[PDB]
Amino acid sequence: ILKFLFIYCLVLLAFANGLNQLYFYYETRAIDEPNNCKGIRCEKQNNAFSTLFETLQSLFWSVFGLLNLYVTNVKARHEFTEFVGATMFGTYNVISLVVLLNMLIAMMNNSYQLIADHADIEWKFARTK
Amino acid sequence: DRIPLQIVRAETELSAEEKAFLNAVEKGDYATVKQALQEAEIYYNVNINCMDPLGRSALLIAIENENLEIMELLLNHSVYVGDALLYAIRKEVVGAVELLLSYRRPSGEKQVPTLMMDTQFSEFTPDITPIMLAAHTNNYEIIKLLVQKRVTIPRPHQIRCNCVECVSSSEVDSLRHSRSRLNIYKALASPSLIALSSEDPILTAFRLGWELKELSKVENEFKAEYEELSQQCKLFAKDLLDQARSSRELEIILNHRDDLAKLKVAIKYHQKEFVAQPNCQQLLATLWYDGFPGWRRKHWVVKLLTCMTIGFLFPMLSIAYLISPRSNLGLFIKKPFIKFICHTASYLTFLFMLLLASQHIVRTDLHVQGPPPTVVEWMILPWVLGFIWGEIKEMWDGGFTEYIHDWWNLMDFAMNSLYLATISLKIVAYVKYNGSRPREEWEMWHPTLIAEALFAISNILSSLRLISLFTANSHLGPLQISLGRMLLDILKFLFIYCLVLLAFANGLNQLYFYYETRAIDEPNNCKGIRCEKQNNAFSTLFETLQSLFWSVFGLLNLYVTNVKARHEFTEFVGATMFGTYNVISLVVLLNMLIAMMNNSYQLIADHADIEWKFARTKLWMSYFDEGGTLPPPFNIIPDSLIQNQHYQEVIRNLVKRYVAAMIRNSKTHEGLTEENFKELKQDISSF
Amino acid sequence: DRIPLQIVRAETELSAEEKAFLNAVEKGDYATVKQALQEAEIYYNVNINCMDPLGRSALLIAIENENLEIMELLLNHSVYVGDALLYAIRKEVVGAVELLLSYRRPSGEKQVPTLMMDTQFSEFTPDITPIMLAAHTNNYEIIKLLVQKRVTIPRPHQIRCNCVECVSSSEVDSLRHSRSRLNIYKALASPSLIALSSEDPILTAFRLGWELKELSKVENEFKAEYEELSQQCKLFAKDLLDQARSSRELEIILNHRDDLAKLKVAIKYHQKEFVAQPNCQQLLATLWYDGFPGWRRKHWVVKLLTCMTIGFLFPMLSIAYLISPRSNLGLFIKKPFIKFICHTASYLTFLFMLLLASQHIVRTDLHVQGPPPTVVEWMILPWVLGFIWGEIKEMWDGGFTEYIHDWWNLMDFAMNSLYLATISLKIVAYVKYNGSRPREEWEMWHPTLIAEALFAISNILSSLRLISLFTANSHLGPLQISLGRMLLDILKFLFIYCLVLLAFANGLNQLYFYYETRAIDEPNNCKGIRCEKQNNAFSTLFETLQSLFWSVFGLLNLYVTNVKARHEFTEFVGATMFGTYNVISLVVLLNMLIAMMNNSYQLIADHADIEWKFARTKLWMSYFDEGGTLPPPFNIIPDSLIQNQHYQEVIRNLVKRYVAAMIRNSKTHEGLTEENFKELKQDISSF
Amino acid sequence: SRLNIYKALASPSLIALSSEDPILTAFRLGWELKELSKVENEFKAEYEELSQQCKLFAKDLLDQARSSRELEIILNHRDDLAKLKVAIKYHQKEFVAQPNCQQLLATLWYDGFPGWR
Amino acid sequence: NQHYQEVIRNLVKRYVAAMIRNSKTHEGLTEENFKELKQDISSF
Ligand SMILES: CC(C)CCC[C@@H](C)[C@H]1CC[C@H]2[C@@H]3CC=C4C[C@@H](OC(=O)CCC(=O)O)CC[C@]4(C)[C@H]3CC[C@]12C
Ligand SMILES: CC(C)CCC[C@@H](C)[C@H]1CC[C@H]2[C@@H]3CC=C4C[C@@H](OC(=O)CCC(=O)O)CC[C@]4(C)[C@H]3CC[C@]12C
Ligand SMILES: [Ca+2]
Ligand SMILES: [Ca+2]
Ligand SMILES: [Zn+2]
Ligand SMILES: [Zn+2]
C-alpha cells in the first residue's frame, strides 16, 4: 500500500496543481456565497479548486464519490474553461478509480498468494516474541 | 454384437528366411549373418534390403543396437546405405557416424545394385541433410566431424522476399517451404554450430535472435517454435558472457567494435538477458558512480545528504563547465551520476516554479484583456526554450528513426506543442487585445483563456513526466514495468468499453432528444449535467456521452431520466437502458478488467527483475555521452586489428569453457547407463 | 588470514587391523573374514563390535550390502545382535529379517559377551520396536513375518487423559512422550497393518482417521503429520471400497451392521472420499430415483414437465397417504424424489402466499389498533404450526446432540421464535387494544408495529431459507460450498473491521458530541442521518456507529462534519478523521478481503466436487427414512451371523485384491535395478 | 573469490566438522550472508540461498534432538533461554518455530495451568 | 560447556548419519554397482 501511495501522491499533486492553476481566478468570498461558508464541507458545494489545499482536499474526496460534479461550474459562462476543467477531473477520476485502485488490488492479491505459503512460521515467531 | 477386428492396411508379410535373417541381426550373432549374406549372393535367398513392418532395416537395426562389426559386414555386402546416416546421427554415437562417413567410397564398382520400392519409409523429411540433423541434436563431436568434411547449409532468404523462386515454391508447396525454413533456422540456432562455424558468436547469436523474433512476429503458425529458438539464442549469448573470469576479459568483450559498443548493440537487439547479467551490471555501476567510490557501503544518511547538497548546487557547477571545462570543478559535472542529479534538480526546480506561478503573491490585476507576462513567466521562459532546444538536439542526433522508439518523446512533443501554443496566444493577446475589460463579459473563445487552459494541461504533463525517473530507484522500477504492461491491458479493455458506451449513448439519445429544453426555461440559466439541479442529460450525443461517462463514478443522479410530461413508458424504458448500461459497465466489464490485469501481473511478476535492469541500463547509458552535459536552463547559453586479435583470443577461451560446461552437464543417467551396459556386454562377449 | 580448520570433535581413530577387517567386510570376500574372526578369538586382535566413524558396524554393513553368508559367519562368531533388526527392516529385504529373527536363539551359552561403550549410536529412537518400524515402512511381507511371531504394539491413551502415568511422563519428558505417541499412531495407521490385524478394516480406518483428526485439532505442533495420517487412512478406506467388482459386494459392504448403516457411519465420521466414490453415488442415485427408472436418459423437457405436474399435485397425494397408505396412489409418496419435490412445492407455496399477503387486495382498514387476522393469515397459520411441529419432531428424534450440528437449525429456530413472537403480539393486540385510532398517532412501541416488523424479518428468513436446496442441482452446489468457506473468511475480516469501526466511532463521538442540537431547532423536526438534509451524525455513539457504517456505501454526505459555529480547526480534524476511516475501510480492508476470498477460492476450487457430493448425499439420506413423509401443511393432521459371515467373505477378497494392487504398484525402477544388480553379482560370483 | 569463500564456509559438513558451536556459527553466517545479500545487489540470489541453507542446517541440527533434557541444554546454553534470545536477535524463524521449541515455550507459558489444551 | 559439547557430539553425528543415508541416490548406487560388476568381471 505504501509503494502504491507514492505513485498516487505524485498523480494527486500533478492534477491538483493543474486544476488550481486553471481555476483560482474564480475564487469567491464567503459573504457572497450562501450560508457564509466556503469549501467542499457545505450543503451546497462551494469553490473546490480555488486554493492548492482546497484542490488537494477535493481531489482526495473525489475518490470516494463525496465530491459532486457542479464544483467545476463557474459563475460566468466560460464554457471552454468549464469543459477543460471537467476533462481534467474526469481524467483524474479515470486514473485513480480504474487504473490505480485495480493495480493495487492485483498487487496485494499477488503478494497475499506469495505470503500465504509461509503464514505459519512468521506467526509462530511473532507469538514467541 | 461382435465388432469385426481385422488388419485393414496389411503390409506384405515377411518371408521365413527374411525373418530368420533380421532375428539373427537383432540377436547380435556375428557368425550367423555371414553365411546368410554369402547364400543371398549365391542362392539369392534373402533380399538384404528387406523391411520389417515396424519401420526398420538390418543395417538400421544394427545402428540401433550400435554394433559395428555387423555394420561393417553388411555394408561390405552392399546394403542400401542411403538415409542411414540420419539414424546414426540421431543415435548420437561417434563410431557409427564415423563408420558410415568413412565407407561412403569403397571403390564402388558397377554403380549401385538396383532397388525398387524400398525408399518408401524414412522417418526424416527429405529436406533434412546430415549437418542440419546434427545441429538439431546439438552434439559437439558429430557436428565437428561433419564440418571437418566440407559440408554446407542453404542460406534462408529475407522474411520480406518477393523473388520468383520463393514465390513459386510457396505457391506450389507451402508446407514443404515452411518446414524447410523452420529446419534451416533450427540448424542455425544451435549453440554448437554458432560456437564452431562463426567467428563472432555473440554478434551471430544477437542477429539470429532478432531474426527469429521477427519471423515469430510475421509467421503466425510457428510462433512458439521461433520464440523458443530466439530464447535459446539469447540464453546461449548470456551463458557465453557468463563464462568470463576477469574484468579485463569483460571489458574486452563489451568494448569490442566491428565506448561500450557491444552493449549498445545488445540494447539495440533487445537482449535483456545479456544486459542484466551481474558482471555487466557491476561494470555499469562502477562507470555510473565514477567519482563516488564505495557508494553502496555508505549509510543512507550520508548518501541522502550528499544528494541533498549536490541537488541544491544546481545553478553552480554548470556555469563552471561554461567558464572552465578543464578545471577540477569543471570536470566534476561530466560524471553520469552528477549529470543525473543535476537534471533531476533542474526538473524539480521547474516544477516548484510552476507551483509558485499559481499563487496570489505574483498574480495581480486579473481584469486586463491582454496581460504582459509576469516576472515568474519571464523567468520561466528560458527553461521552456531549453527544453525546446534539448528536444531539437535529441531529434537530430541519433536520427529520426530512433527518436520515435523511446515512447516518452510523444509526451515531450505534446508538452512542446502546448508551450508554443500558449506562448503564441499570450503574444497575440498582448499585441492586439489592448484593454481592461472585466472577465465576467469575455468571449468564450478568448485566446487568453485558451492560453491558460493549455498552460494548465502542459503543467499536468510536466508534473506527470516524473514517472520516467522511477527506474533509478530499486523499488519503483518493476512497479512501473507492471504499470506499462497493465496499461496495454487497459487499452485492450477500453476498446470494448468505448464500443459499449457508443452503443448505449446512441440508444439513449435516439430515445430522448425530443424533450430537449432551452436554458432560459430551466433554473439558473444553465443546461447540462454540470449544474446544481441535473438538467437534460440525454438531449445531444455529446451530452449523452458525457452523462454515460460520468455515470460510472456515480456522479450522475437518477432523476436525469425524468421528463416534464407524464410519459411513464418512455421514462421506464430510458431507466431500463440506463440500468442495463450500469450493470454492464460496473458489474461485468470492470471486474473483467480486474481479473485481466491481475492475471497479467501474475505472469509479469516472475520476470520483473530483468526488464527493470534493462530499463535502468538504458537510462544509465543516456548520461554516459557528452551530448547533453548542461541542464535545460543552461544548454542554450552560447588499431582495429589489435582489438580483433584480443577479442578472438578471449572468444577462444570463452567458447572452449562453454563447450566443456555443456559436455559435463550433458552426461546424464540414461546415457551413462547405456554406455555402461554396452561396455559390460562388449567385455563379456570378448572374454 | 588463514582461518584454522581442524577436527574439533575427534572420534577415536580406527586401528589398522580394524580398518582391514571392515574393508574386507565391505569388499564382500567371504574367505578373508573367517581367519580374522578366528584370530580375534584366539589372539584378540580385532574387536568384532568396532565402529567406523560414519555410523556403521560389520554386521550392519553386511546388512546394507545384503550378503547373508557374511551375516551368518559374523553372528556365529557372536556379534552384538541388538538394534540390527531395525536396519534390516528399513532395508526391506526378507532374507535378512528372516535370518536375524531365526537366529535370535542359537542355544546361547554363558549369557552374552560383555560390552562397554558401543551402544552409543543408534539411528532409531529407543521407543521403536521392530513391528512399529515395519508398519512405518509399509511392507506386507515383513509385517506378516513379524505378526506371525506373536508381537504387540502398546495402546495409546485417550487424548483427554488425566491419569497419573500419562501426566508424569508428560511432565518428566514431554518430547519422548510426543514422539512415542506419534510413532504409535504412525504404526497403527499403515494400510498393511489394518489389512492384516483388524477384522473390520473399513471401520478401523474410519475410527483411526477420526482419532487422528481430533489429535491434529488438539496437538498444535504435529498438525501436519496427524493430518497426513488421517488422509492416508481415508484414502485407504476409499481404495478398499474401490476394489469392489459387483453390486452385490457393494450392497453387502454398505448395508453391513455391527438400511445403509455403514454409509451413515461414514457420514458421521466425515469420510468424504468414501461417500463420494462413484459406485456408492450410483447406488444412491438408483435408490433416490426409486419410481422413475432411466431419469438420466430423458430429455430435459419431459423431466421438467414431470417435475411441473408433480409439484402442482402437492395438495393431492398427501391426503391420499392419510386415507390409504397401502394403495397404489398412497405408496407413491414414500419414494425420496417425490418427497423432495413435494416439500419443495410446499415451501414454494408458502413463499408465494407470503408474497400474496403483501398486496392491497386482501389488506383492508389499516386504521384499527388491534386487527383480527385476515383470511390469508388464517390460512397461513397451519403452515406455521406445521413447521413448528416438524422442528419439534426433528429435535426429539436423532437427539439434541445431532440437531445442533446441522447449522441450518439456527435459522429455523430464529424463524420459529419470530413466528411465535408475532403470533403472541397479534393475539395480545386483539384482546386488549380494542379501538380504531389512526396510525399517525400510535405509540412507537405499539405491539402491532413490533409484530409486523418481526413478521417482515421472518419473511426474509423464510425466503432466504431456499439456499439449502442448491445441493440438489449440479451447478449450484460447489458454488454454495465456496460461499460457505468464503463466509468464514468474511467473519475473520469483520472482526478487524468491527474493531476499526469502534475505534473511529469513539474518536469522532468524543470530538463531536458537544454540538448536538435538538430536533425542534433543526428543519422538518428530524434528527439523524435518515433525513433529507443530513443532520448531526456524530452526536451519539449509536449515531456515530450508524454514520460510519453508512459511509462505506457512500450514502453519508460530506457536510455532516460541519458545525454551526466557525470552529475551523475542529471541523478540519473531524474531516481528517473521517477521511482516514474512509481510506482504511475502502482502500485497505475491502481490497484485503477481495484478495483473501480469491486466495481461498483458488484453494477450494480443486476439491469442489467431493464436498458437494457429500452434501448432496447428506440431503438425499434425509428423505430415505419414513419420519417426515407428510408435507408441513399435513404433518399435524391426526440373522446377524449370516451378515457377518458374508461381510468377512467380501472383506477377504477386497483386502487380498488391495494388497495385490499395492505390491505390483510397489515394484519401482530403483528396486528392480537393485534386485537385478544383486542377482547378476550373485550369478557371476557363483559361476 | 568472496562468493566462493562464503559458499565454502556455509556448507553444513564444514560447520559440523570445524566449528565447536555449529548452531551459533550457523546463526552468524546466516546473518552475515543476509547482510551481504542486502549490500551486494548482483549476487542477491546466491547469498539468499546460502543464508537459507545455513538456517535449514541449524533447524535440522535442532530437530535431531531426542529428549527434553537435550532440548533444554541446547536452548539454555550461554557463551534463561539465552540461545533462543540469540536466535530471535538473528531472525532465525525456522529455528524458533520448530515444534519442540514451541512445546517447551508453551509449557513455560502455561506455568500454573497444566493441561490447558 | 561440557554438557553442551556432549549434546552437540550426538546431534552432529546423528545429522551426518541422516545425510549420508539420504545422500545415496539411484544414480550413485547404479554407478557403484556398475563399477563393482566391471571390476569383478575383469578380475575373474
Ligand atoms: C511524495 C510526493 C511528495 C511526491 C514527490 C515527487 C518527487 C519530489 C519525487 C517522485 C520521484 C522521486 C525520484 C525517484 C527516484 C530517485 C532516484 C534516487 O536515487 C537512487 O535510487 C540511487 C541509485 C541510482 O539511481 O543511481 C534519487 C532520488 C530520485 C531522483 C527521486 C527524487 C524525488 C522524486 C522526483
Ligand atoms: C430466479 C428467481 C426468480 C428466484 C427463483 C427462486 C426459486 C423459485 C428457485 C431457487 C432455487 C430453485 C431450486 C434449485 C434446485 C432444484 C433442484 C432441481 O432438481 C435437480 O437438480 C435434479 C436432480 C435431483 O435433485 O435429484 C429441481 C428444481 C429445484 C428444487 C429448484 C426449484 C426452484 C428454486 C427453489
Ligand atoms: Ca526526450
Ligand atoms: Ca430443520
Ligand atoms: Zn527469395
Ligand atoms: Zn493415561
Question: Maximum distance among all alpha carbons in chain D?
Answer: 56
Rounded distance between C-alpha atoms, residue B576 and residue C176, angstroms: 72
CB pairs under 8 A between C and E: 39
**Cα–Cα distance list, C501 to B486, C496, C516, C536, C550 (Å):** 34, 9, 21, 18, 11
C-alpha of residue B354 to centroid of ligand 3, in Å:
20
Q: What angle do CA B71, B74, B79 make, to 5 degrees?
A: 115
Provide the 10 A C-beta neighbour count for residue A115: 12
Q: Residues of B511-521 as b/e, b for ≥16 C-beta within 10 angstroms?
A: bbeebeeeeee
Measured between beta carbons, which residues in chain A are less than 8 angstroms from residue C582? 64
Cell of C618: 447428506
Contact C659, C192 (CB under 8 A): yes
Sign of the alpha-carbon dihedral angle for B581, B586, B588, B590: positive
Cell of C304: 421438467
**Cα–Cα distance list, B283 to B251, B260, B303 (Å):** 8, 11, 21
From start to end of B292-380, where are the E strands? none
Q: Which of B676, B68, B120, A64 is nearest to C587 (CA)?
A: A64
The minimum CA-CA distance between B229 and chain D, rounded to whole Å, is: 27
- Residue C230 in 3-state DSSP? helix
- Residue B56 in 3-state DSSP? strand
Rounded distance between C-alpha atoms, residue C664 and residue B66, angstroms: 33
Q: Is there a contact between D102 and A128 if contact means CB atoms under 8 Å apart?
A: yes
Cell of C641: 451371523
- Burial (CB count <10 Å: 0-12, 13-18, 19+), residue C646: middle
| Cα-to-chain-centroid distance, residue C150 | 37
Q: Which of B112, B152, B111, B156 is nearest to B129 (CA)?
A: B152
Give the torsion through C-alpha atoms of C564, C568, C571, C572, to 10 deg: 160
Q: Which atom of ligand 1 is nearest to the CA of A10?
A: 4
Q: Is there a contact between C579 and A61 if contact means CB atoms under 8 Å apart?
A: yes
Q: Which of B115, B139, B124, B112 is nearest to B86 (CA)?
A: B124
Strand partners, C56: C52
Q: Which of C581, C411, C565, C599 is nearest to C509 (CA)?
A: C581
Which method was it determined by?
cryo-EM
Contact B135, B193 (CB under 8 A): yes
Residue type, B206: F
Residue type, B686: S
- Burial (CB count <10 Å: 0-12, 13-18, 19+), residue B463: buried
Q: Which of B77, B251, B136, B338 is nearest to B643 (CA)?
A: B251
All chains having 3 or more CB pairs closer than 8 angstroms to chain D: A, B, C, E
Give the torsion through C-alpha atoms of B499, B503, B506, B507, to 10 deg: -170
Strand partners, B52: B56
Match 559390460 to its residue by C-alpha cell: B680
Q: Is B464 in the pocket of ligand 1 (CB under 6 A)?
A: no
**DSSP assignment letter at C10:** P
Q: Which atom of ligand 1 is nearest to the CA of B347?
A: 35
Check the annotation: does B41 bind a ligand: no
- Burial (CB count <10 Å: 0-12, 13-18, 19+), residue C330: middle
Provide the 10 A C-beta neighbour count for residue B435: 8
Rounded distance between C-alpha atoms, residue D83 and residue D89, angstroms: 10
All chains having 3 or more CB pairs closer than 8 angstroms to chain A: B, C, D
Residue type, B255: N
**Cα–Cα distance list, B196 to A3, B200, B472, C75 (Å):** 49, 10, 40, 63
Residue nearest to atom 4 of ligand 1 (CA): A10
Rounded distance between C-alpha atoms, residue C419 and residue C551, angstroms: 34
Residue nearest to atom 5 of ligand 1 (CA): A10
Rounded distance between C-alpha atoms, residue B232 and residue B238, angstroms: 10
Determine phi and psi for E22, rounding to 5 degrees: -90, 5
From start to end of B347-399, where are the E strands? none
Rounded distance between C-alpha atoms, residue C68 and residue C48, angstroms: 17
Rounded distance between C-alpha atoms, residue C438 and residue C448, angstroms: 13
Rounded distance between C-alpha atoms, residue C284 and residue C617, angstroms: 8
All chains having 3 or more CB pairs closer than 8 angstroms to chain E: B, C, D
**Residue-wise DSSP of C600-665:** HHHHHGGGTTHHHHHHHHHHHTTTTSSTT-S-TTTTT---HHHHHHHHHHHHHHHHHHHHHHHHTT
Helix ranges restricted to H, C138-246: 140-147, 164-172, 174-188, 191-197, 201-218, 223-242
Provide the 10 A C-beta neighbour count for residue C90: 19
Residue B568 φ/ψ region, left for φ over 0, alpha for ψ in the -120 to 50 degree band, beta for the rest: alpha
Whether the CB of C2 is below 8 Å from some CB of chain D: the reply is: no
Q: Is there a contact between E42 and B679 if contact means CB atoms under 8 Å apart?
A: no
Measured between beta carbons, which residues in chain E are less than 8 angstroms from residue D20? 5
Contact B184, B129 (CB under 8 A): no
Q: Is there a contact between D96 and A120 if contact means CB atoms under 8 Å apart?
A: no
Helix ranges restricted to H, B324-374: 336-356
Rounded distance between C-alpha atoms, residue C546 and residue B596, angstroms: 36
All chains having 3 or more CB pairs closer than 8 angstroms to chain C: A, D, E
Helix ranges restricted to H, B28-67: 30-42, 58-64
Contact B217, B193 (CB under 8 A): no
What is the Cα gyration radius of chain A?
20
* Best residue of E8, E21, E44 to probe chain C, by most C CBs closer than 10 Å: E21
Cell of C682: 550373485
C-alpha of residue C251 to centroid of ligand 4, in Å:
29
C-alpha of residue C484 to centroid of ligand 6, in Å:
38
Cell of C347: 415451501
Q: Which of E9, E14, E40 sits opposite C684 (nearest CB)?
A: E40
Residue of A nearest to D96 (CA): A125
Measured between beta carbons, which residues in chain B are less than 8 angstroms from residue E25? none
Measured between beta carbons, which residues in chain C are less than 8 angstroms from residue E42? none
Rounded distance between C-alpha atoms, residue B486 and residue B602, angstroms: 11
Q: How big, in percent rounded to 5, are the helix, strand and coil portions of chain E?
A: 85, 0, 15
Q: Which atom of ligand 1 is nearest to the CA of B337?
A: 26
Strand partners, C253: none
C-alpha of residue B269 to centroid of ligand 3, in Å:
21
- Residue C56 in 3-state DSSP? strand
3-class SS letters over A60-127: HHCCCCCCCCHHHCCCCCCHHHHHHHHHHHHHHHHHHHHHHHHHHHHHHHHHHHHHHHHCCHHHHHHH
Long-range contact list for B244-250, CB < 8 A, 24+ apart?
B244/B279, B244/B654, B247/B283, B249/B650, B249/B653, B249/B654, B250/B279, B250/B280, B250/B283
Cell of C11: 572420534
* Best residue of D2, D62, D67, D107 to probe chain C, by most C CBs closer than 10 Å: D67
Residues 6+ positions from C261 with CB-CB distance below 8 Å: C254, C255
C-alpha of residue B415 to centroid of ligand 1, in Å:
22
Measured between beta carbons, which residues in chain B are less than 8 angstroms from residue A75? 440
Rounded distance between C-alpha atoms, residue C128 and residue C87, angstroms: 12
Q: Which atom of ligand 2 is nearest to the CA of C303?
A: 22
The minimum CA-CA distance between E22 and chain D, rounded to whole Å, is: 13
Residues in chain B whose C lies over 2.5 Å from the next residue's N (breaks after) = 258, 638
Rounded distance between C-alpha atoms, residue B93 and residue B81, angstroms: 17
Residue nearest to atom 32 of ligand 2 (CA): C344
Provide the 10 A C-beta neighbour count for residue B620: 19
Rounded distance between C-alpha atoms, residue C437 and residue C365, angstroms: 11
Contact A85, A73 (CB under 8 A): no
Cell of D106: 508453551
- Burial (CB count <10 Å: 0-12, 13-18, 19+), residue B4: exposed
**DSSP assignment letter at C551:** T
Q: Which residues of C are annotated as a binding site?
A: 157, 161, 163, 166, 391, 394, 409, 412
Element (H, E) at B497: helix B477-512
Determine phi and psi for C524, rounding to 5 degrees: 65, 15
Rounded distance between C-alpha atoms, residue C205 and residue C184, angstroms: 15
**Cα–Cα distance list, C451 to B273, C386, C458 (Å):** 74, 20, 10
Whether the CB of A75 is below 8 Å from some CB of chain D: the reply is: no
Contact B484, B407 (CB under 8 A): no
Q: Is A7 in the pocket of ligand 1 (CB under 6 A)?
A: no
Rounded distance between C-alpha atoms, residue B187 and residue B135, angstroms: 5
Residue type, D116: W
Q: Residues of E9-30 as b/e, b for ≥16 C-beta within 10 angstroms?
A: eebbbbbbbeeeeeeeeeeeeb
Cell of C465: 431459507
Q: Which of C379, C333, C353, C385 is nearest to C632 (CA)?
A: C385
Whether the CB of A53 is below 8 Å from some CB of chain C: the reply is: no
The CATH number that domain C16-286 falls under is 1.25.40.20
Contact B68, B95 (CB under 8 A): yes
3-class SS letters over D27-96: HHHHHHHHHHHHHCCCCHHHHHHHHHHHHHHHHHHHHCCCCHHHHHHHHCCCCCCHHHHHHHHCCCHHHH
Contact C195, C144 (CB under 8 A): no
Contact B547, B535 (CB under 8 A): no
Cell of B335: 560524471
**Residue-wise DSSP of C404-458:** TTSSSHHHHHHHHHHHHHHHHHHHHHHHH--S---GGG--TT-HHHHHHHHHHHH
Whether the CB of E30 is below 8 Å from some CB of chain B: the reply is: yes
Strand partners, C52: C56
Contact A74, A26 (CB under 8 A): yes
Q: Which of B649, B618, B678 is nearest to B253 (CA)?
A: B649
Contact B469, B613 (CB under 8 A): no
Contact B579, A85 (CB under 8 A): no
Cell of C145: 513375518
Q: Is there a contact between C554 and A108 if contact means CB atoms under 8 Å apart?
A: no
**DSSP assignment letter at B52:** B
The minimum CA-CA distance between B296 and chain D, rounded to whole Å, is: 7
Cell of C437: 385510532
Measured between beta carbons, which residues in chain C are less than 8 angstroms from residue D67? 173, 175-176
Ligand nearest to the CA of C348: 2
Whether the CB of B455 is below 8 Å from some CB of chain A: the reply is: yes
Check the annotation: does B521 bind a ligand: no
- Burial (CB count <10 Å: 0-12, 13-18, 19+), residue B413: middle
Ligand nearest to the CA of A6: 1
Q: Residues of C117-154 as b/e, b for ≥16 C-beta within 10 angstroms?
A: eeeeebebeebbbbbbbbbbebbbebbebbbeeeeeee
Contact C144, C663 (CB under 8 A): no
**Cα–Cα distance list, B655 to B194, B195, B664, C10 (Å):** 10, 6, 15, 46
Element (H, E) at C377: helix C375-396
| Cα-to-chain-centroid distance, residue C488 | 14
Residues 6+ positions from C240 with CB-CB distance below 8 Å: C195, C201, C202, C205, C654, C655, C658
End-to-end CA distance of chain A: 26
Rounded distance between C-alpha atoms, residue C69 and residue B422, angstroms: 103
Residue nearest to atom 31 of ligand 2 (CA): C469
Whether the CB of A29 is below 8 Å from some CB of chain B: the reply is: no
From start to end of E1-44, where are the E strands? none
Contact B180, B128 (CB under 8 A): no
Sequence length of chain C is 687
Q: Angle, to 10 degrees, between the axis of helix B409-432 and the axis of helix B447-464? A: 150
Contact B47, B53 (CB under 8 A): no
Q: Is there a contact between D22 and E14 if contact means CB atoms under 8 Å apart?
A: no
Strand partners, B56: B52
- Burial (CB count <10 Å: 0-12, 13-18, 19+), residue B53: exposed
Match 467542499 to its residue by C-alpha cell: A40
Element (H, E) at C588: none
Sign of the alpha-carbon dihedral angle for C275, C276, C282, C286: positive
Rounded distance between C-alpha atoms, residue B203 and residue B210, angstroms: 11
3-class SS letters over C150-176: CCCCCCCCCCCCCCHHHHHHHHHCHHH
Contact B239, B275 (CB under 8 A): no
| Cα-to-chain-centroid distance, residue D70 | 16
Q: Is there a contact between E20 and C54 if contact means CB atoms under 8 Å apart?
A: yes
Q: Is there a contact between B279 and D39 if contact means CB atoms under 8 Å apart?
A: no
Contact B340, B472 (CB under 8 A): yes
3-class SS letters over C291-351: CCCCCCCCCHHHHHHHHHHHHHCCCCCCHHHHHCCCCCCHHHHCCHHHHHHHHHHHHHHHH
Measured between beta carbons, which residues in chain B are less than 8 angstroms from residue A61? none
Whether the CB of A101 is below 8 Å from some CB of chain C: the reply is: yes
The minimum CA-CA distance between D48 and chain E, rounded to whole Å, is: 22
Measured between beta carbons, which residues in chain E are less than 8 angstroms from residue C9? 5, 8-9, 12
Q: Which of C432, C347, C431 is nearest to C390 (CA)?
A: C347
